PDB file of all heavy atoms in Angstrom:
ATOM      1  N   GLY A   1     172.457 155.411  72.635  1.00 25.75           N
ATOM      2  CA  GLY A   1     171.651 156.180  73.599  1.00 25.75           C
ATOM      3  C   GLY A   1     170.202 156.119  73.266  1.00 25.75           C
ATOM      4  O   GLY A   1     169.344 155.979  74.131  1.00 25.75           O
ATOM      5  N   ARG A   2     169.923 156.216  71.984  1.00 25.69           N
ATOM      6  CA  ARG A   2     168.554 156.111  71.458  1.00 25.69           C
ATOM      7  C   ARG A   2     167.858 154.753  71.735  1.00 25.69           C
ATOM      8  O   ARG A   2     166.681 154.725  72.127  1.00 25.69           O
ATOM      9  CB  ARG A   2     168.593 156.453  69.965  1.00 25.69           C
ATOM     10  CG  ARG A   2     167.273 156.852  69.409  1.00 25.69           C
ATOM     11  CD  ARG A   2     166.834 158.263  69.790  1.00 25.69           C
ATOM     12  NE  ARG A   2     165.480 158.443  69.241  1.00 25.69           N
ATOM     13  CZ  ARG A   2     164.367 158.683  69.927  1.00 25.69           C
ATOM     14  NH1 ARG A   2     164.364 158.886  71.241  1.00 25.69           N
ATOM     15  NH2 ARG A   2     163.230 158.750  69.260  1.00 25.69           N
ATOM     16  N   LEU A   3     168.618 153.676  71.654  1.00 24.71           N
ATOM     17  CA  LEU A   3     168.129 152.326  71.939  1.00 24.71           C
ATOM     18  C   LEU A   3     167.754 152.251  73.404  1.00 24.71           C
ATOM     19  O   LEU A   3     166.698 151.802  73.764  1.00 24.71           O
ATOM     20  CB  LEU A   3     169.145 151.260  71.530  1.00 24.71           C
ATOM     21  CG  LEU A   3     169.312 151.111  69.983  1.00 24.71           C
ATOM     22  CD1 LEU A   3     170.339 150.053  69.611  1.00 24.71           C
ATOM     23  CD2 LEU A   3     168.036 150.759  69.314  1.00 24.71           C
ATOM     24  N   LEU A   4     168.619 152.760  74.265  1.00 27.70           N
ATOM     25  CA  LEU A   4     168.299 152.788  75.678  1.00 27.70           C
ATOM     26  C   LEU A   4     167.075 153.605  76.043  1.00 27.70           C
ATOM     27  O   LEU A   4     166.244 153.190  76.920  1.00 27.70           O
ATOM     28  CB  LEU A   4     169.503 153.226  76.479  1.00 27.70           C
ATOM     29  CG  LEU A   4     170.651 152.231  76.494  1.00 27.70           C
ATOM     30  CD1 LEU A   4     171.940 152.915  76.877  1.00 27.70           C
ATOM     31  CD2 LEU A   4     170.387 151.041  77.424  1.00 27.70           C
ATOM     32  N   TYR A   5     166.967 154.769  75.424  1.00 26.19           N
ATOM     33  CA  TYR A   5     165.770 155.631  75.584  1.00 26.19           C
ATOM     34  C   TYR A   5     164.483 154.907  75.137  1.00 26.19           C
ATOM     35  O   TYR A   5     163.460 154.923  75.844  1.00 26.19           O
ATOM     36  CB  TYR A   5     165.921 156.987  74.841  1.00 26.19           C
ATOM     37  CG  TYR A   5     165.401 158.060  75.681  1.00 26.19           C
ATOM     38  CD1 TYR A   5     166.240 158.765  76.596  1.00 26.19           C
ATOM     39  CD2 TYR A   5     163.980 158.335  75.681  1.00 26.19           C
ATOM     40  CE1 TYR A   5     165.678 159.747  77.454  1.00 26.19           C
ATOM     41  CE2 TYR A   5     163.415 159.304  76.506  1.00 26.19           C
ATOM     42  CZ  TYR A   5     164.261 160.015  77.427  1.00 26.19           C
ATOM     43  OH  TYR A   5     163.607 160.943  78.259  1.00 26.19           O
ATOM     44  N   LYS A   6     164.562 154.250  73.979  1.00 30.27           N
ATOM     45  CA  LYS A   6     163.451 153.474  73.471  1.00 30.27           C
ATOM     46  C   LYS A   6     163.145 152.357  74.472  1.00 30.27           C
ATOM     47  O   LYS A   6     162.002 152.074  74.733  1.00 30.27           O
ATOM     48  CB  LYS A   6     163.826 152.814  72.128  1.00 30.27           C
ATOM     49  CG  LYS A   6     162.719 151.958  71.496  1.00 30.27           C
ATOM     50  CD  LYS A   6     161.415 152.721  71.383  1.00 30.27           C
ATOM     51  CE  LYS A   6     160.268 151.776  71.108  1.00 30.27           C
ATOM     52  NZ  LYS A   6     160.178 151.391  69.658  1.00 30.27           N
ATOM     53  N   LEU A   7     164.149 151.677  75.004  1.00 27.66           N
ATOM     54  CA  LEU A   7     163.838 150.597  75.986  1.00 27.66           C
ATOM     55  C   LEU A   7     163.115 151.171  77.156  1.00 27.66           C
ATOM     56  O   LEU A   7     162.195 150.563  77.693  1.00 27.66           O
ATOM     57  CB  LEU A   7     165.103 149.884  76.448  1.00 27.66           C
ATOM     58  CG  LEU A   7     164.931 148.757  77.473  1.00 27.66           C
ATOM     59  CD1 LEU A   7     164.023 147.643  76.904  1.00 27.66           C
ATOM     60  CD2 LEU A   7     166.279 148.209  77.810  1.00 27.66           C
ATOM     61  N   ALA A   8     163.472 152.384  77.549  1.00 29.96           N
ATOM     62  CA  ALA A   8     162.837 152.988  78.720  1.00 29.96           C
ATOM     63  C   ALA A   8     161.371 153.293  78.432  1.00 29.96           C
ATOM     64  O   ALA A   8     160.523 153.115  79.293  1.00 29.96           O
ATOM     65  CB  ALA A   8     163.564 154.239  79.179  1.00 29.96           C
ATOM     66  N   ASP A   9     161.085 153.756  77.220  1.00 32.02           N
ATOM     67  CA  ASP A   9     159.721 153.982  76.804  1.00 32.02           C
ATOM     68  C   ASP A   9     158.905 152.689  76.734  1.00 32.02           C
ATOM     69  O   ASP A   9     157.733 152.691  77.040  1.00 32.02           O
ATOM     70  CB  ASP A   9     159.702 154.627  75.391  1.00 32.02           C
ATOM     71  CG  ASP A   9     160.225 156.045  75.386  1.00 32.02           C
ATOM     72  OD1 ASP A   9     160.168 156.727  76.421  1.00 32.02           O
ATOM     73  OD2 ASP A   9     160.624 156.500  74.317  1.00 32.02           O
ATOM     74  N   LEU A  10     159.521 151.598  76.286  1.00 35.04           N
ATOM     75  CA  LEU A  10     158.828 150.292  76.270  1.00 35.04           C
ATOM     76  C   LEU A  10     158.494 149.772  77.703  1.00 35.04           C
ATOM     77  O   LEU A  10     157.373 149.313  78.012  1.00 35.04           O
ATOM     78  CB  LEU A  10     159.696 149.297  75.500  1.00 35.04           C
ATOM     79  CG  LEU A  10     159.751 149.561  74.008  1.00 35.04           C
ATOM     80  CD1 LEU A  10     160.719 148.560  73.383  1.00 35.04           C
ATOM     81  CD2 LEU A  10     158.386 149.513  73.380  1.00 35.04           C
ATOM     82  N   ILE A  11     159.441 149.934  78.598  1.00 35.07           N
ATOM     83  CA  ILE A  11     159.233 149.576  80.014  1.00 35.07           C
ATOM     84  C   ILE A  11     158.138 150.422  80.617  1.00 35.07           C
ATOM     85  O   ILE A  11     157.263 149.899  81.329  1.00 35.07           O
ATOM     86  CB  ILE A  11     160.485 149.668  80.815  1.00 35.07           C
ATOM     87  CG1 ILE A  11     161.407 148.536  80.391  1.00 35.07           C
ATOM     88  CG2 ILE A  11     160.178 149.570  82.335  1.00 35.07           C
ATOM     89  CD1 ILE A  11     162.845 148.757  80.858  1.00 35.07           C
ATOM     90  N   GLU A  12     158.095 151.688  80.222  1.00 35.51           N
ATOM     91  CA  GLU A  12     157.046 152.564  80.659  1.00 35.51           C
ATOM     92  C   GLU A  12     155.694 152.077  80.101  1.00 35.51           C
ATOM     93  O   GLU A  12     154.687 152.128  80.797  1.00 35.51           O
ATOM     94  CB  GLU A  12     157.330 153.979  80.206  1.00 35.51           C
ATOM     95  CG  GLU A  12     156.406 155.047  80.780  1.00 35.51           C
ATOM     96  CD  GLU A  12     156.888 156.421  80.338  1.00 35.51           C
ATOM     97  OE1 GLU A  12     156.847 156.682  79.104  1.00 35.51           O
ATOM     98  OE2 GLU A  12     157.366 157.228  81.168  1.00 35.51           O
ATOM     99  N   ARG A  13     155.697 151.604  78.842  1.00 33.40           N
ATOM    100  CA  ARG A  13     154.493 151.026  78.239  1.00 33.40           C
ATOM    101  C   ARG A  13     153.998 149.783  79.021  1.00 33.40           C
ATOM    102  O   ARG A  13     152.825 149.636  79.289  1.00 33.40           O
ATOM    103  CB  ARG A  13     154.752 150.696  76.757  1.00 33.40           C
ATOM    104  CG  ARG A  13     153.483 150.274  76.010  1.00 33.40           C
ATOM    105  CD  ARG A  13     153.810 149.552  74.711  1.00 33.40           C
ATOM    106  NE  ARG A  13     154.511 148.301  74.975  1.00 33.40           N
ATOM    107  CZ  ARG A  13     155.183 147.599  74.065  1.00 33.40           C
ATOM    108  NH1 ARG A  13     155.245 147.999  72.814  1.00 33.40           N
ATOM    109  NH2 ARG A  13     155.794 146.484  74.400  1.00 33.40           N
ATOM    110  N   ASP A  14     154.905 148.898  79.402  1.00 34.79           N
ATOM    111  CA  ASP A  14     154.547 147.692  80.097  1.00 34.79           C
ATOM    112  C   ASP A  14     154.673 147.797  81.622  1.00 34.79           C
ATOM    113  O   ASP A  14     154.932 146.792  82.291  1.00 34.79           O
ATOM    114  CB  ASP A  14     155.396 146.547  79.581  1.00 34.79           C
ATOM    115  CG  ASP A  14     155.105 146.219  78.140  1.00 34.79           C
ATOM    116  OD1 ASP A  14     154.201 146.853  77.603  1.00 34.79           O
ATOM    117  OD2 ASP A  14     155.793 145.331  77.557  1.00 34.79           O
ATOM    118  N   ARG A  15     154.481 148.990  82.156  1.00 36.09           N
ATOM    119  CA  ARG A  15     154.699 149.259  83.569  1.00 36.09           C
ATOM    120  C   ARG A  15     153.757 148.471  84.483  1.00 36.09           C
ATOM    121  O   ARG A  15     154.157 147.919  85.495  1.00 36.09           O
ATOM    122  CB  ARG A  15     154.505 150.716  83.842  1.00 36.09           C
ATOM    123  CG  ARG A  15     155.099 151.179  85.160  1.00 36.09           C
ATOM    124  CD  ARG A  15     154.859 152.663  85.315  1.00 36.09           C
ATOM    125  NE  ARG A  15     155.160 153.151  86.661  1.00 36.09           N
ATOM    126  CZ  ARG A  15     155.265 154.438  86.975  1.00 36.09           C
ATOM    127  NH1 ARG A  15     155.150 155.379  86.037  1.00 36.09           N
ATOM    128  NH2 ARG A  15     155.554 154.807  88.201  1.00 36.09           N
ATOM    129  N   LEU A  16     152.483 148.443  84.115  1.00 36.54           N
ATOM    130  CA  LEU A  16     151.475 147.723  84.890  1.00 36.54           C
ATOM    131  C   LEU A  16     151.833 146.262  84.989  1.00 36.54           C
ATOM    132  O   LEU A  16     151.917 145.674  86.045  1.00 36.54           O
ATOM    133  CB  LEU A  16     150.115 147.900  84.212  1.00 36.54           C
ATOM    134  CG  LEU A  16     149.563 149.321  84.218  1.00 36.54           C
ATOM    135  CD1 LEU A  16     148.205 149.362  83.562  1.00 36.54           C
ATOM    136  CD2 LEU A  16     149.469 149.833  85.641  1.00 36.54           C
ATOM    137  N   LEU A  17     152.056 145.669  83.844  1.00 34.79           N
ATOM    138  CA  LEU A  17     152.475 144.323  83.747  1.00 34.79           C
ATOM    139  C   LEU A  17     153.754 144.005  84.552  1.00 34.79           C
ATOM    140  O   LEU A  17     153.828 142.976  85.298  1.00 34.79           O
ATOM    141  CB  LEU A  17     152.718 144.127  82.283  1.00 34.79           C
ATOM    142  CG  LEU A  17     152.993 142.830  81.565  1.00 34.79           C
ATOM    143  CD1 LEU A  17     152.612 143.127  80.098  1.00 34.79           C
ATOM    144  CD2 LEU A  17     154.433 142.336  81.704  1.00 34.79           C
ATOM    145  N   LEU A  18     154.780 144.851  84.406  1.00 33.21           N
ATOM    146  CA  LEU A  18     156.067 144.502  84.988  1.00 33.21           C
ATOM    147  C   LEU A  18     155.990 144.640  86.519  1.00 33.21           C
ATOM    148  O   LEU A  18     156.563 143.850  87.222  1.00 33.21           O
ATOM    149  CB  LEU A  18     157.221 145.328  84.390  1.00 33.21           C
ATOM    150  CG  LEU A  18     157.662 144.956  82.978  1.00 33.21           C
ATOM    151  CD1 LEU A  18     158.459 146.091  82.362  1.00 33.21           C
ATOM    152  CD2 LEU A  18     158.488 143.702  83.038  1.00 33.21           C
ATOM    153  N   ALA A  19     155.262 145.635  86.984  1.00 34.18           N
ATOM    154  CA  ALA A  19     155.114 145.900  88.389  1.00 34.18           C
ATOM    155  C   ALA A  19     154.316 144.742  89.040  1.00 34.18           C
ATOM    156  O   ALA A  19     154.599 144.339  90.150  1.00 34.18           O
ATOM    157  CB  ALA A  19     154.405 147.243  88.609  1.00 34.18           C
ATOM    158  N   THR A  20     153.389 144.179  88.286  1.00 35.65           N
ATOM    159  CA  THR A  20     152.547 143.104  88.784  1.00 35.65           C
ATOM    160  C   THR A  20     153.404 141.857  88.856  1.00 35.65           C
ATOM    161  O   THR A  20     153.410 141.112  89.848  1.00 35.65           O
ATOM    162  CB  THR A  20     151.322 142.904  87.842  1.00 35.65           C
ATOM    163  OG1 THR A  20     150.541 144.114  87.813  1.00 35.65           O
ATOM    164  CG2 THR A  20     150.475 141.743  88.313  1.00 35.65           C
ATOM    165  N   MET A  21     154.150 141.633  87.802  1.00 38.09           N
ATOM    166  CA  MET A  21     155.040 140.489  87.724  1.00 38.09           C
ATOM    167  C   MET A  21     156.082 140.569  88.846  1.00 38.09           C
ATOM    168  O   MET A  21     156.363 139.572  89.503  1.00 38.09           O
ATOM    169  CB  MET A  21     155.711 140.457  86.333  1.00 38.09           C
ATOM    170  CG  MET A  21     156.450 139.172  86.032  1.00 38.09           C
ATOM    171  SD  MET A  21     157.226 139.107  84.392  1.00 38.09           S
ATOM    172  CE  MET A  21     155.801 138.846  83.355  1.00 38.09           C
ATOM    173  N   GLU A  22     156.632 141.767  89.066  1.00 39.02           N
ATOM    174  CA  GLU A  22     157.670 141.977  90.096  1.00 39.02           C
ATOM    175  C   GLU A  22     157.118 141.615  91.488  1.00 39.02           C
ATOM    176  O   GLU A  22     157.757 140.881  92.268  1.00 39.02           O
ATOM    177  CB  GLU A  22     158.157 143.445  90.064  1.00 39.02           C
ATOM    178  CG  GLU A  22     159.439 143.743  90.838  1.00 39.02           C
ATOM    179  CD  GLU A  22     160.757 143.337  90.101  1.00 39.02           C
ATOM    180  OE1 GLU A  22     160.824 142.288  89.401  1.00 39.02           O
ATOM    181  OE2 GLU A  22     161.765 144.077  90.251  1.00 39.02           O
ATOM    182  N   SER A  23     155.926 142.154  91.762  1.00 38.60           N
ATOM    183  CA  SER A  23     155.208 141.940  93.017  1.00 38.60           C
ATOM    184  C   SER A  23     154.875 140.453  93.260  1.00 38.60           C
ATOM    185  O   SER A  23     155.205 139.865  94.306  1.00 38.60           O
ATOM    186  CB  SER A  23     153.961 142.828  93.010  1.00 38.60           C
ATOM    187  OG  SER A  23     153.193 142.689  94.213  1.00 38.60           O
ATOM    188  N   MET A  24     154.276 139.822  92.265  1.00 39.36           N
ATOM    189  CA  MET A  24     153.905 138.413  92.365  1.00 39.36           C
ATOM    190  C   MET A  24     155.081 137.433  92.584  1.00 39.36           C
ATOM    191  O   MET A  24     154.957 136.437  93.329  1.00 39.36           O
ATOM    192  CB  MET A  24     153.180 138.000  91.071  1.00 39.36           C
ATOM    193  CG  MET A  24     152.218 136.849  91.243  1.00 39.36           C
ATOM    194  SD  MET A  24     151.320 136.510  89.707  1.00 39.36           S
ATOM    195  CE  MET A  24     150.625 138.130  89.366  1.00 39.36           C
ATOM    196  N   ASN A  25     156.166 137.653  91.842  1.00 39.05           N
ATOM    197  CA  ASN A  25     157.314 136.749  91.834  1.00 39.05           C
ATOM    198  C   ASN A  25     158.237 137.119  92.994  1.00 39.05           C
ATOM    199  O   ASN A  25     158.850 136.252  93.615  1.00 39.05           O
ATOM    200  CB  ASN A  25     158.049 136.889  90.464  1.00 39.05           C
ATOM    201  CG  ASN A  25     159.219 135.922  90.273  1.00 39.05           C
ATOM    202  OD1 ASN A  25     159.958 136.056  89.289  1.00 39.05           O
ATOM    203  ND2 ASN A  25     159.376 134.914  91.153  1.00 39.05           N
ATOM    204  N   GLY A  26     158.322 138.410  93.288  1.00 40.27           N
ATOM    205  CA  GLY A  26     159.314 138.948  94.220  1.00 40.27           C
ATOM    206  C   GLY A  26     158.842 139.193  95.652  1.00 40.27           C
ATOM    207  O   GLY A  26     159.669 139.445  96.542  1.00 40.27           O
ATOM    208  N   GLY A  27     157.524 139.067  95.882  1.00 42.58           N
ATOM    209  CA  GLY A  27     156.902 139.341  97.172  1.00 42.58           C
ATOM    210  C   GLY A  27     156.944 140.808  97.531  1.00 42.58           C
ATOM    211  O   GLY A  27     156.947 141.177  98.713  1.00 42.58           O
ATOM    212  N   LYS A  28     157.003 141.656  96.508  1.00 42.87           N
ATOM    213  CA  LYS A  28     157.166 143.065  96.686  1.00 42.87           C
ATOM    214  C   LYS A  28     155.839 143.718  96.636  1.00 42.87           C
ATOM    215  O   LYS A  28     155.053 143.445  95.744  1.00 42.87           O
ATOM    216  CB  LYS A  28     158.047 143.586  95.540  1.00 42.87           C
ATOM    217  CG  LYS A  28     158.376 145.063  95.590  1.00 42.87           C
ATOM    218  CD  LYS A  28     159.265 145.532  94.434  1.00 42.87           C
ATOM    219  CE  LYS A  28     160.603 144.797  94.241  1.00 42.87           C
ATOM    220  NZ  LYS A  28     161.647 145.344  95.141  1.00 42.87           N
ATOM    221  N   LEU A  29     155.564 144.582  97.590  1.00 41.98           N
ATOM    222  CA  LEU A  29     154.356 145.368  97.612  1.00 41.98           C
ATOM    223  C   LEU A  29     154.112 146.028  96.250  1.00 41.98           C
ATOM    224  O   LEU A  29     155.002 146.763  95.726  1.00 41.98           O
ATOM    225  CB  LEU A  29     154.507 146.496  98.660  1.00 41.98           C
ATOM    226  CG  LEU A  29     154.583 146.065 100.146  1.00 41.98           C
ATOM    227  CD1 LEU A  29     154.734 147.281 101.054  1.00 41.98           C
ATOM    228  CD2 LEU A  29     153.307 145.284 100.532  1.00 41.98           C
ATOM    229  N   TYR A  30     152.914 145.821  95.701  1.00 39.17           N
ATOM    230  CA  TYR A  30     152.554 146.381  94.386  1.00 39.17           C
ATOM    231  C   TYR A  30     152.742 147.898  94.319  1.00 39.17           C
ATOM    232  O   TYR A  30     153.318 148.377  93.358  1.00 39.17           O
ATOM    233  CB  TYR A  30     151.132 145.970  93.943  1.00 39.17           C
ATOM    234  CG  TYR A  30     150.772 146.590  92.628  1.00 39.17           C
ATOM    235  CD1 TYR A  30     151.311 146.098  91.467  1.00 39.17           C
ATOM    236  CD2 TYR A  30     149.998 147.718  92.560  1.00 39.17           C
ATOM    237  CE1 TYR A  30     151.025 146.657  90.258  1.00 39.17           C
ATOM    238  CE2 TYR A  30     149.703 148.302  91.334  1.00 39.17           C
ATOM    239  CZ  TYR A  30     150.252 147.778  90.183  1.00 39.17           C
ATOM    240  OH  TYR A  30     150.000 148.339  88.926  1.00 39.17           O
ATOM    241  N   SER A  31     152.321 148.655  95.334  1.00 39.54           N
ATOM    242  CA  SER A  31     152.472 150.124  95.284  1.00 39.54           C
ATOM    243  C   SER A  31     153.912 150.577  95.173  1.00 39.54           C
ATOM    244  O   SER A  31     154.163 151.548  94.462  1.00 39.54           O
ATOM    245  CB  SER A  31     151.860 150.886  96.466  1.00 39.54           C
ATOM    246  OG  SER A  31     152.512 150.538  97.663  1.00 39.54           O
ATOM    247  N   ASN A  32     154.814 149.924  95.907  1.00 38.91           N
ATOM    248  CA  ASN A  32     156.217 150.164  95.767  1.00 38.91           C
ATOM    249  C   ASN A  32     156.691 149.674  94.393  1.00 38.91           C
ATOM    250  O   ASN A  32     157.422 150.394  93.754  1.00 38.91           O
ATOM    251  CB  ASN A  32     157.069 149.489  96.843  1.00 38.91           C
ATOM    252  CG  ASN A  32     156.779 150.010  98.264  1.00 38.91           C
ATOM    253  OD1 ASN A  32     156.266 151.114  98.468  1.00 38.91           O
ATOM    254  ND2 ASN A  32     157.115 149.198  99.237  1.00 38.91           N
ATOM    255  N   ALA A  33     156.296 148.468  93.959  1.00 40.02           N
ATOM    256  CA  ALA A  33     156.772 147.979  92.688  1.00 40.02           C
ATOM    257  C   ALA A  33     156.462 148.980  91.582  1.00 40.02           C
ATOM    258  O   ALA A  33     157.275 149.174  90.682  1.00 40.02           O
ATOM    259  CB  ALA A  33     156.209 146.624  92.328  1.00 40.02           C
ATOM    260  N   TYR A  34     155.308 149.613  91.654  1.00 40.85           N
ATOM    261  CA  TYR A  34     154.840 150.470  90.597  1.00 40.85           C
ATOM    262  C   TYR A  34     155.402 151.869  90.703  1.00 40.85           C
ATOM    263  O   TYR A  34     155.849 152.474  89.670  1.00 40.85           O
ATOM    264  CB  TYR A  34     153.295 150.517  90.572  1.00 40.85           C
ATOM    265  CG  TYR A  34     152.746 151.391  89.450  1.00 40.85           C
ATOM    266  CD1 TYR A  34     152.521 150.882  88.165  1.00 40.85           C
ATOM    267  CD2 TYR A  34     152.454 152.713  89.677  1.00 40.85           C
ATOM    268  CE1 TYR A  34     152.039 151.705  87.140  1.00 40.85           C
ATOM    269  CE2 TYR A  34     151.982 153.536  88.668  1.00 40.85           C
ATOM    270  CZ  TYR A  34     151.760 153.008  87.402  1.00 40.85           C
ATOM    271  OH  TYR A  34     151.299 153.844  86.423  1.00 40.85           O
ATOM    272  N   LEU A  35     155.378 152.407  91.915  1.00 39.30           N
ATOM    273  CA  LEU A  35     155.740 153.812  92.146  1.00 39.30           C
ATOM    274  C   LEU A  35     157.227 154.043  92.355  1.00 39.30           C
ATOM    275  O   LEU A  35     157.712 155.142  92.090  1.00 39.30           O
ATOM    276  CB  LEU A  35     154.968 154.421  93.327  1.00 39.30           C
ATOM    277  CG  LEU A  35     153.436 154.354  93.185  1.00 39.30           C
ATOM    278  CD1 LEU A  35     152.783 154.779  94.516  1.00 39.30           C
ATOM    279  CD2 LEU A  35     152.978 155.232  92.006  1.00 39.30           C
ATOM    280  N   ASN A  36     157.930 153.000  92.797  1.00 41.90           N
ATOM    281  CA  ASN A  36     159.344 153.106  93.116  1.00 41.90           C
ATOM    282  C   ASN A  36     160.177 152.316  92.199  1.00 41.90           C
ATOM    283  O   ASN A  36     160.935 152.894  91.469  1.00 41.90           O
ATOM    284  CB  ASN A  36     159.593 152.689  94.572  1.00 41.90           C
ATOM    285  CG  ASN A  36     158.873 153.603  95.521  1.00 41.90           C
ATOM    286  OD1 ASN A  36     158.439 154.681  95.129  1.00 41.90           O
ATOM    287  ND2 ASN A  36     158.740 153.200  96.753  1.00 41.90           N
ATOM    288  N   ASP A  37     160.054 150.993  92.201  1.00 40.80           N
ATOM    289  CA  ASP A  37     160.935 150.203  91.385  1.00 40.80           C
ATOM    290  C   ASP A  37     160.846 150.615  89.889  1.00 40.80           C
ATOM    291  O   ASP A  37     161.869 150.839  89.240  1.00 40.80           O
ATOM    292  CB  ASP A  37     160.623 148.742  91.511  1.00 40.80           C
ATOM    293  CG  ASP A  37     160.953 148.221  92.913  1.00 40.80           C
ATOM    294  OD1 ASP A  37     160.364 148.778  93.858  1.00 40.80           O
ATOM    295  OD2 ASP A  37     161.801 147.310  93.059  1.00 40.80           O
ATOM    296  N   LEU A  38     159.625 150.696  89.373  1.00 40.78           N
ATOM    297  CA  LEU A  38     159.446 150.794  87.937  1.00 40.78           C
ATOM    298  C   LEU A  38     159.859 152.169  87.491  1.00 40.78           C
ATOM    299  O   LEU A  38     160.559 152.282  86.469  1.00 40.78           O
ATOM    300  CB  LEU A  38     158.016 150.513  87.520  1.00 40.78           C
ATOM    301  CG  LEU A  38     157.816 149.141  86.914  1.00 40.78           C
ATOM    302  CD1 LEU A  38     158.388 149.118  85.504  1.00 40.78           C
ATOM    303  CD2 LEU A  38     158.412 148.046  87.777  1.00 40.78           C
ATOM    304  N   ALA A  39     159.465 153.176  88.275  1.00 39.21           N
ATOM    305  CA  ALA A  39     159.939 154.540  88.121  1.00 39.21           C
ATOM    306  C   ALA A  39     161.463 154.653  88.169  1.00 39.21           C
ATOM    307  O   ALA A  39     162.035 155.353  87.347  1.00 39.21           O
ATOM    308  CB  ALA A  39     159.322 155.482  89.127  1.00 39.21           C
ATOM    309  N   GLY A  40     162.110 154.021  89.134  1.00 36.17           N
ATOM    310  CA  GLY A  40     163.564 153.991  89.163  1.00 36.17           C
ATOM    311  C   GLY A  40     164.187 153.273  87.991  1.00 36.17           C
ATOM    312  O   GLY A  40     165.213 153.709  87.459  1.00 36.17           O
ATOM    313  N   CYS A  41     163.606 152.156  87.569  1.00 36.44           N
ATOM    314  CA  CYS A  41     164.046 151.554  86.298  1.00 36.44           C
ATOM    315  C   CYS A  41     164.019 152.502  85.084  1.00 36.44           C
ATOM    316  O   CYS A  41     164.982 152.560  84.298  1.00 36.44           O
ATOM    317  CB  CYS A  41     163.169 150.339  85.920  1.00 36.44           C
ATOM    318  SG  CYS A  41     163.666 148.937  86.859  1.00 36.44           S
ATOM    319  N   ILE A  42     162.897 153.202  84.918  1.00 36.21           N
ATOM    320  CA  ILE A  42     162.713 154.073  83.787  1.00 36.21           C
ATOM    321  C   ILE A  42     163.686 155.270  83.845  1.00 36.21           C
ATOM    322  O   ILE A  42     164.384 155.586  82.858  1.00 36.21           O
ATOM    323  CB  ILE A  42     161.238 154.538  83.710  1.00 36.21           C
ATOM    324  CG1 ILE A  42     160.315 153.332  83.427  1.00 36.21           C
ATOM    325  CG2 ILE A  42     161.063 155.621  82.654  1.00 36.21           C
ATOM    326  CD1 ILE A  42     158.844 153.607  83.756  1.00 36.21           C
TER     327      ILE A  42
END
């Protein structure tokens, strides 16, 4: 459980990056990628 929690904190750390990557590769609106996808991941 702790490993998963830590992964969530790391994803939260790299949120800007991942949301940008998601948007660029996926054709996904950046605001949604950041506010919805990444939040739902975390």
Side-chain angles (χ1 to χ4, degrees):
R2 200 76 184 118
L3 290 179
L4 292 160
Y5 222 91
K6 180 52 195 279
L7 179 60
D9 291 335
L10 289 176
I11 289 164
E12 189 175 65
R13 188 198 64 196
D14 294 357
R15 197 179 169 167
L16 294 182
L17 189 158
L18 286 162
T20 299
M21 191 179 285
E22 194 79 323
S23 180
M24 206 176 305
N25 184 188
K28 182 180 304 277
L29 293 180
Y30 178 75
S31 64
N32 297 338
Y34 181 87
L35 303 171
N36 298 345
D37 292 59
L38 256 286
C41 281
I42 295 162

